[PDB]
Ligand binder design. Sequence first.
Ligand SMILES: CO[C@H]1CN(c2ccc(C#C[C@@]3(O)CN4CCC3CC4)c(Cc3ccccc3)n2)C[C@H]1O
Lengths: 335, 335, 334, 332, 334, 335
Amino acid sequence: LSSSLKTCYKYLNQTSRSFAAVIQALDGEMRNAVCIFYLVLRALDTLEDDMTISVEKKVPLLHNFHSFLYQPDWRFMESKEKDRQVLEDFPTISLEFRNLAEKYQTVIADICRRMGIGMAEFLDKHVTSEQEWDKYCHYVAGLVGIGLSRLFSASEFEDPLVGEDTERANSMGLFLQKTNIIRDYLEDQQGGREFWPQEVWSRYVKKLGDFALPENIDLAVQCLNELITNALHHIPDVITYLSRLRNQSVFNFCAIPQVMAIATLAACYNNQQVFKGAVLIRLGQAVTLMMDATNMPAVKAIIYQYMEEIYHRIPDSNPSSSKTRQIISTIRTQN
Amino acid sequence: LSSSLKTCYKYLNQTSRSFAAVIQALDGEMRNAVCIFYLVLRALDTLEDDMTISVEKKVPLLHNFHSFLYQPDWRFMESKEKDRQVLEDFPTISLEFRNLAEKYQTVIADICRRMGIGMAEFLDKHVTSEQEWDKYCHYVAGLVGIGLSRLFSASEFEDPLVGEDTERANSMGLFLQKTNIIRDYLEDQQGGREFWPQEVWSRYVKKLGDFALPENIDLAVQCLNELITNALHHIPDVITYLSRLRNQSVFNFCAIPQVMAIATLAACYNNQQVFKGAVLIRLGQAVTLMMDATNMPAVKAIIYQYMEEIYHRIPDSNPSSSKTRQIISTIRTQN
Amino acid sequence: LSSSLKTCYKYLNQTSRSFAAVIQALDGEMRNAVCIFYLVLRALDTLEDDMTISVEKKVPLLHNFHSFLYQPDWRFMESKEKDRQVLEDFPTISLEFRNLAEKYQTVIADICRRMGIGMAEFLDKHVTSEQEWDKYCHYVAGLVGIGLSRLFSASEFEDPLVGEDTERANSMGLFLQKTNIIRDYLEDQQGGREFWPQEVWSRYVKKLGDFALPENIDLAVQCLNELITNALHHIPDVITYLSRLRNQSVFNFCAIPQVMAIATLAACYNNQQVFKGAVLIRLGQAVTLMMDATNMPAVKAIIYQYMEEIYHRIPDSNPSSSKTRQIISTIRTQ
Amino acid sequence: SLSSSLKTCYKYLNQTSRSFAAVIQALDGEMRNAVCIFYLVLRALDTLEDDMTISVEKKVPLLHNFHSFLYQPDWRFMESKEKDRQVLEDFPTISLEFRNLAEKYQTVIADICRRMGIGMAEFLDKHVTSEQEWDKYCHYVAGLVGIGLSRLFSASEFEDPLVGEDTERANSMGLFLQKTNIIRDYLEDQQGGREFWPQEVWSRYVKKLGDFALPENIDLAVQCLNELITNALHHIPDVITYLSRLRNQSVFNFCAIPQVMAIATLAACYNNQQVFKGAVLIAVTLMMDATNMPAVKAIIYQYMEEIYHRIPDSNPSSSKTRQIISTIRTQN
Amino acid sequence: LSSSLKTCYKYLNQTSRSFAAVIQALDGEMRNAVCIFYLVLRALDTLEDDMTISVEKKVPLLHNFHSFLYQPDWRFMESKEKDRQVLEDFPTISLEFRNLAEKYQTVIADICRRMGIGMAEFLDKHVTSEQEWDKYCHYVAGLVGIGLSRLFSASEFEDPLVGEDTERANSMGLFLQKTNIIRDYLEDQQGGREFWPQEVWSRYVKKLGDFALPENIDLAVQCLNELITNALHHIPDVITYLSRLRNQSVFNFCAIPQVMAIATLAACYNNQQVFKGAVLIRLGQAVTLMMDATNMPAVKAIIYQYMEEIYHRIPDSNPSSSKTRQIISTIRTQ
Amino acid sequence: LSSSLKTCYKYLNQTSRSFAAVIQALDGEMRNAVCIFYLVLRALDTLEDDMTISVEKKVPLLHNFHSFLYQPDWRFMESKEKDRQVLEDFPTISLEFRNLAEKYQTVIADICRRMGIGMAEFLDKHVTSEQEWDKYCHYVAGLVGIGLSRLFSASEFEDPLVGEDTERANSMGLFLQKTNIIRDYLEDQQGGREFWPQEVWSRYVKKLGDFALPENIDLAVQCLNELITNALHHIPDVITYLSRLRNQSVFNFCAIPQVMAIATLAACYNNQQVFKGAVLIRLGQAVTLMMDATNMPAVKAIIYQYMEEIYHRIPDSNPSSSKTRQIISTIRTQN
Ligand SMILES: CO[C@H]1CN(c2ccc(C#C[C@@]3(O)CN4CCC3CC4)c(Cc3ccccc3)n2)C[C@H]1O
């Protein structure tokens, strides 16, 4: 009934392309909790992205963002990004945050603190190792999967296990983040951002930006398949995690984005287009045509169908061909 | 093995484009009760539309139609309409009506009696105020939502509350009827039928027929968007009503047509093609692709997706622009 | 993390174009049990189809196939089939089979044995009568539907009532098989074998190969509608059988294949393309574009929409029209 | 408000039914009225069969056409002198509600009424002789009813299609109840001039069935009582199988409770001289009711042991009784 | 292991002869929420019944009782009633109240607030019409059935439709209350408390206390039967309300007390003993002892047997005979 | 249709007045396993209790009994007990023991082995401390609770937790055993056996037999209430144990005997009749009557009512009054 809450949801739909719909469809207290949660992370993320903010002035913000949640008057009017109104009109957001049950804000604020730490940390460096890729993805998405699970277990809509297995929840976050990192190479590159792991791309070319160069299209695709193969290893945890949910609204919120990500990886696999523009979500085969992602067995079938689309297009001489068949074979056989 | 019951279903399939399937999919008792309810209403509508029937002769028929249900031999042989078979062979349909449990009989007859009254009432006039629009929609559709709701409750497949809350039931009907009226502007025009509320279109043109003329397309679309905005006010009730359903076959029957109507309004909003012919139902955003309208959370997600599709296309100039944002905001925040 | 199990699933995906995913989606012990069940039946079918194997050497292999399951070192390297890797490497499959629980093994073996016997029977004869056509289908598909039902109950993921209803489980199989046969006419014509009952086509033309003759397209399409009408008679049992299920993974597994088959028949009905080439699962109505085969009410709606897509195309010319409408009518009032 | 005719039917149900009104009224949705009406028409038919003031010549056509009177709106019978005659004199009210039932239910009920009428007519001139004939008679008046009820459960979709298809198990449900009642109502019937115990059985004990009423034959009476009960016990395995297939709670309650009461009646009558002098009066159990399958099994097993340890070694059925009880005990 | 919570359950058992067991049997959070709810109502009721508290002092206590839940030190030490311990040690009870989740606190406080106003309203008067009887029963019990329903839904153990149906929840309360009021005629008369509606008993006697007079036994039993007939009218709602429940612990909690009340009315119907002391629930027709009140179909059967017990004892001469038959007919038929 | 298996069931019904029915009602594989388990224990108990079998002969019989299960022809023809038939025809029982799945054999044999040793350990002594009472009861009943639980988990009709939590399984047996020992005081006394713990009764009289003396009735009842109070301490575990069962047949089997034991204790509490003969079912209350022990909530309510029947009788002057109120209070407020 609130006017500020009405504003929060307006922002959610303003800044979110993939989650407003499933968030708003969440039952009870999760609706506003997840909604608010998304808004604070957006504002936080909007800070790390504004390069017009000196590193000397930005480190503080990231580190003490979790504290601005309790500062009714706090805000930021010195941002030029496109999602500024959430910082400028942050008071409206912080307000609703404080209207949440403590237990929920005890989770959201903890994550905001821990994320701000990781984000600041990677502020003056790029991802080198695959281990550091995980690490970075942990700070910006893995902790969100962890934070979301704890919110679910806290509302009691889901068993406490969900919130306890930070590992599985971590994978949920990593799979989405890696998928988007892979798919947005060109966009990120043209923006001056580099997220692909140097220890992986340096085996192909001198510098990451070279993949934007058409003469390197063959090497680029090869690196793409290696990165995708890497992300595929999280699928086992995704299935395990999804298979433990019992609340329908929570399952949709969780399953749908994951399936959309898997669908994106299948479309991007061995696809030169990843280096020319944006990629389009191929719906599944003739079987998936008759099924959606709202029940576990169907989500399984859909995933397996997307694996065969990848498996069937694997180039014999691709340097990762063996690795790709290995993980896919593991996904087919695991139960 | 009843030839008459078989004949009824043959008729159901010959006249119901979008309901035969979901109707025949209803569990047990509701199947025949809803099939027959559709057929009798179908016959009533056929009489109501037959312009070759003099008013003086049509009024008593609409008024007394409900009584023919109990007259074994009653039938109408002077109709030229396409679906005239349900009138010429009414004895077959009325016979099955009399075979339904008494509790379903009383609901259908009562609704038929009240609908006939309202249909005759609007035979000599057109819709003036937006209030008359609601009254007209109530008589030919709202009452149907209420009738169906009463059958669902009486069958025990759904809670007593579904049949009791007539306002929510009424909204289900108004939303479908308003959507179809908005969608079929042109077709009705080329038929001497005017359903758009006078007190609304008279603010853009002086002759409803003027919207078909393109010197006014810009005004016609303004009127179009206003009416759609009116119709959107029923969605909160539609969500509330669907949220109370617990029987899957009933949920399918109720939700699917509602979701299709919402998809339709989104495909007509600020769309010039409405005044040039038929419109198509673009799928639902990337997410929707993975969601069937067979569970409440999914239906919500879908409904929100469409709301944003409309919200994203609101011209700042459109005279209803702020009302359209207002209702959409109320729908997305309201839990 | 078993090596041989991973291989079985590699063959599952390899040989099956439409069951792999739904099989891998099955709950607990049904997963490997049905996968293995599909591979063995696959190997067995591979033999029957291989025409290089003599009529005297084939019969034995068919009759004893079920025993090979317990004979570790048993293999077969003298086949020219595209899916011979299952025969050549049968030990990998027999091993995992032997790793299944006793309850599952029993079922699978029994079906293989009975199927074997049946397949041998039609090695020298042909599909003459419709009753005969049911007989064959019962052997190559009907019994499989029963085996699956039994596995569901044995797994106890489904009520004991499922495995008991052998009559409708058999119908599940008969419907799919008659459908594949009807849709795969030309490919089977240009292949050497004919599965369409002579008693039915013999009343249309003198040779099944004659349907491939453009100068008979009419007679062709008419014989087509006639057979399809025959397959539609199984739908009531399919609906009843599916209505009984309570496990989501089992329902998806049973319902999606059946629905696709129905979509198939609706595409083939009164269609010439069944004789020139192969058909497309043309889109469904507007409503169906909303639902998917994962819950019974939705499966009913989808079925009804295909029945109407067919019914509205019935030409009152067809010697079958009367019968086509008759069964659909029955399907509508159930 | 709605149908006062239906209210009259439930009034008759409670008027004529001593043991089923409550569980029938408790059935879910459609089964409720269908089973109520089914009970009432059978009750009218039985009232005609049992009325001895109606000559056999006049009675046979009524029994043969009863199933058709269901479709004759004004038909009724005003010459019955039986205590339950109100259902015949006001049959129009009952057939009216019978005709308001969905057709799939009418079909089942009329069919059972038709077949039962034929069977009842067939037994008006003859007595029950062989055990095979005893089953036949029980099939007509009760076996077909179990079959009828089962077909209604499947037709309603509250139970699996199998329930109505397995006519043998459904038939056993009826026989067990009817044999039990026949065994328990020996005296009452003898005093009414009606004989139901198989002649080929009681003849091996006395010359005239009415002799068991005589104290000087009590020992022989009890021996016969035990042979019949022993016979009746053979239906239990089928009863258990039947109940174990039910999935609807209201249907389970309706089917099991009557069967348990009948089993409790046999246990109370076994080797009991009371069956021949007056009326018979019906510990782990007392913590359980007959509303879930495992509990029903337990209750049945307890009753079986009650009979088992009471079996007189001298009794000539002694071995037959132990064998069937052992068979029930070890049955899966 | 809270000592204060330990004390609350101790108080629950000291004051509730017929609810402690089913309350302690409730799943998860409903357990404490309903225990506390019972205790605070027990205190409020003791205040209402204490005739040593003047009306001008009592009105504020009743009106503001709900606010006392949030006053840690509030308590009442001037009561002479038998259950005054909950009032004298109210802080221990209000403490556990404040420990309950906010969603439960809100429902309990709201019902105390509303009940406080209703009780106060009736301090200066006796129940007159049957409409007034319903209003009074609504205030002291109807609101509790409504409150309990909201607690069930708030805990998620029950569907939200349960708390939403205030009409039937209200009937659940009126039924228990009217039954107790009927049963306790004598005990209330000897206590100087009159609850039987005046517009009803004044048609039989000059003073409600006259029913305690042996020479009016006949006019007393008739009034008794008229009140029971009135109470029977809530059974349809009771059955409807119970059919909606899905959680076993909640079902037992709601069904058992209703069934005991039904057994009580049957025992009291046309029973002279009502005016000479308490009445014994013995009851049980054939079927009964082979089924208890823990599943809906059984509950229905048990209720039907009790309705038949009453129906079979309805005297022709009784002024309510027709009405009594009508309502039971309605119960058994629909 | 095995003649040896039905002979086994004949013996079960012949030697078990209160478990034969619920055992026979057990689902699938549990049925035979539990039937056989009961028979072998019945045979073992028949040896232990036979006083015509010398200590010299008995010790080897109790210690090796478990091995006789594997010896096809082992039998014992010198028993003078009433149930000697199971010993003389042991090959029939052992044959069926060996036909059970190996996993069940492991359990049954293990328990017979452990029980054998425990019984042997007590042939030469009486029960002294309360710690020893627990030990004796563990050997003859607690181990059975553990064994039965392991059979349930092995069969998979119950979760592995049922079999793993041996402490709760042990409590189920101790409760029943302690209840039987309390109830059978007088019968055992006239039998020459003493089971009441000496460290408890000695604090009241010189010899256990003195409680049977009319002049010691007051002291006797006091002792009785102390032992009963002791037994009540297992109730929380009984509730915990039963609350975890998922299979209806297993629930009935475990719950009914437990509730019956609770009713017995309630009936014996502060009851002088315990020392003049036997006692029985204090028929419950008004709430009880309306509920059976086939669902957990109902079992809880039934148990709580009996706790109150006891609570209501605790006389302030009983030496154990405070201890009795304490454990009962603990039983009331534990979730
Ligand atoms: C409460 O939710 C329900 C509301 N629904 C409605 C509402 C109204 C109608 C209608 C209608 C008509 O009067 C309009 N027109 C077409 C059908 C009849 C006769 C002429 C219809 C059509 C209809 C369907 C089935 C039986 C009767 C009518 N459906 C279906 C669910 O969304």
